[PDB]
């Protein structure tokens, strides 16, 4: 199946109005800088207590 008359560029630009991601959340760890995503581990391998992993 295919269209009869070709869709113009403005139809495409209208359609993709909703294909936009939702931004994530910035978070400042109490024992780590390098602002991170909320509800996950940090970059310094911590989570506020529990140095569970290294940085490697």
């Amino acid at each position: 199946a295919v269209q009869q008359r070709r869709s113009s560029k403005h139809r495409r630009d209208k359609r993709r109005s909703h294909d936009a991601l939702t931004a994530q959340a910035l978070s400042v760890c109490q024992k780590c800088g390098k602002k991170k995503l909320f509800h996950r581990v940090c970059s310094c391998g911590m989570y506020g207590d529990l140095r569970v992993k290294k940085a490697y």
């Binding site: 995503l37 509800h39 996950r40 581990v41 989570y47 529990l50 569970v52 992993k53």
Partner: protein
């Protein structure tokens, strides 16, 4: 449609669950997909709870849920369990382990997560 890979059927799932729980018992920390770790923690805490009895029936029951690794053999792993795993988990009922959320993977961008043991 036609012939394809066997996939993630139940037998493969439980086999991977047992392998993962044996590995995490052998070492202590495991990084993997969050859902799989959350599912496997049930069997993990089941085995930990059943291991505190220290009886031959419990040994026989838990034998069919453990696969050895490079660090410990099956007998070595059972000896480790009877040595330094049970006594620490007598004062805390259930919830012996914790799971935390790691960042996304580079290639698949799926939610990685770590599972470890705690007091």
């Amino acid at each position: 449609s036609y012939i394809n890979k066997p996939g993630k059927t139940s037998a493969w799932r439980v086999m991977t669950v047992r392998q993962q729980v044996s590995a995490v018992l052998a070492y202590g920390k495991i990084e993997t997909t969050l859902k799989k770790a959350k599912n496997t923690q049930k069997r993990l805490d089941k085995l930990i709870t059943l291991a505190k009895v220290d009886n031959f029936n419990n040994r026989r029951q838990v034998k069919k849920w453990l696969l050895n690794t490079n660090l410990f053999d099956v007998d070595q792993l059972m000896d480790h369990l009877f040595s330094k795993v049970a006594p620490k988990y007598e004062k805390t009922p259930g919830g012996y382990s914790r799971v935390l959320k790691l960042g996304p993977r580079r290639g698949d961008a799926t939610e990685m997560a770590i599972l470890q043991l705690t007091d």
